[PDB]
Paper text:
Surprisingly, p63 and p73 require a second helix in their tetramerization domain for the formation of stable tetramers that is absent in human p53, raising questions about the evolutionary processes leading to diversification. Crystallographic studies on the zebrafish p53 tetramerization domain then confirmed the presence of the p63/p73 signature helix in p53 proteins of a subgroup of bony fishes, providing evidence that the last common ancestor of p53, p63, and p73 also had an extended domain with an additional helix that was subsequently lost in many modern-day p53 proteins as a result of divergent evolution.
To see whether the C-terminal helix of the zebrafish p53 tetramerization domain plays an equally pivotal role in stabilizing the overall architecture of the tetramer, we created a deletion variant comprising residues 302-331, DRp53(302-331). We determined its structure in three different crystal forms grown at different pH (5.0, 7.0, and 9.0) and ionic strength, up to a resolution of 1.0 Å. The last turn of helix H1 partially unwinds in the truncated domain, and in some chains, the C-terminal carboxylate group of Val331 folds back onto the tetramer and forms a salt bridge with Arg314 from an adjacent subunit, thereby displacing Asp229 that normally interacts with the arginine. In contrast, the packing angle of the H1 helices in zebrafish p53 is not significantly affected by deletion of the second helix, and the truncated domain has essentially the same dimer and tetramer architecture as human p53.
Residue numbers in the entry:
A (entry chain C): 300 to 331
B (entry chain D), D (entry chain A): 303 to 331
C (entry chain B): 303 to 330
The structure:
Amino acid sequence: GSEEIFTLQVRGRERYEILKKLNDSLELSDVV
Amino acid sequence: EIFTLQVRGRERYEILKKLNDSLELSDVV
Amino acid sequence: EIFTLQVRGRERYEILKKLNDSLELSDV
Amino acid sequence: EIFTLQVRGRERYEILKKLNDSLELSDVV
């Protein structure tokens, strides 16, 4: 097998929100 | 302010890591 | 509603294309 | 070596521009 879980530490709320939206997008689209 | 972002999959992690590290260096946001 | 983004370099393009394609699909 | 991305929507475009600009600035040896 299964995909493993990895964690990224992000500094800044605006930066986090962008990266979260990308992560969530990729989960839905499965592009990566 | 520090957050954790939990990512499924090594390839997905690698793309987000590249972006995070880039943003830390550039300070664009 | 369509905007052109100029990107320098293949690796940079390939990253951003993956994201753009993903966002097109997850835009619900 | 210029590529173009067609991005639909202001908000999406603004995110991808920030990332592009960041990756240009963090492109260091």
